[PDB]
């Protein structure tokens, strides 16, 4: 109340997006949001994810394929 050793929009910060929790240094809440974001992802394809954010691909199939190969052949 007092926390972010960044200290030491008001939104729900006081009644307790990540940006910036981050900020201002509220360790615990970073964990609150980062874990639920992480869920946004667990079990989603790379497309499914980049859809549901706004990262458009910047992988030219040359590389996009070569990665998918390493990933699957060697790391799964």
């Amino acid at each position: 109340a007092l926390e972010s050793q960044t200290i030491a929009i008001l939104a729900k910060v006081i009644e307790y997006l990540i940006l910036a929790a981050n900020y201002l240094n509220i360790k615990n809440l970073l964990d609150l949001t980062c874990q639920t974001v992480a869920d946004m992802i667990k079990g989603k394809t790379p497309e499914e994810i980049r859809t549901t954010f706004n990262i458009k691909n910047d992988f030219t199939p040359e590389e996009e394929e070569e990665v998918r190969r390493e990933n699957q052949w060697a790391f799964e």
């Binding site: 992802i41 667990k42 079990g43 989603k44 394809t45 790379p46 994810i49 980049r50 954010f53 990262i55 691909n57 910047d58 992988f59 996009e64 990665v67 998918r68 990933n71 699957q72 790391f75 799964e76």
Partner: peptide, 13 residues
């Protein structure tokens, strides 16, 4: 999860 890790590595550079 390995499969989830892989999956993040392929979203962008």
């Amino acid at each position: 999860l390995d499969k989830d890790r892989n999956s993040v590595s392929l979203v962008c550079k």
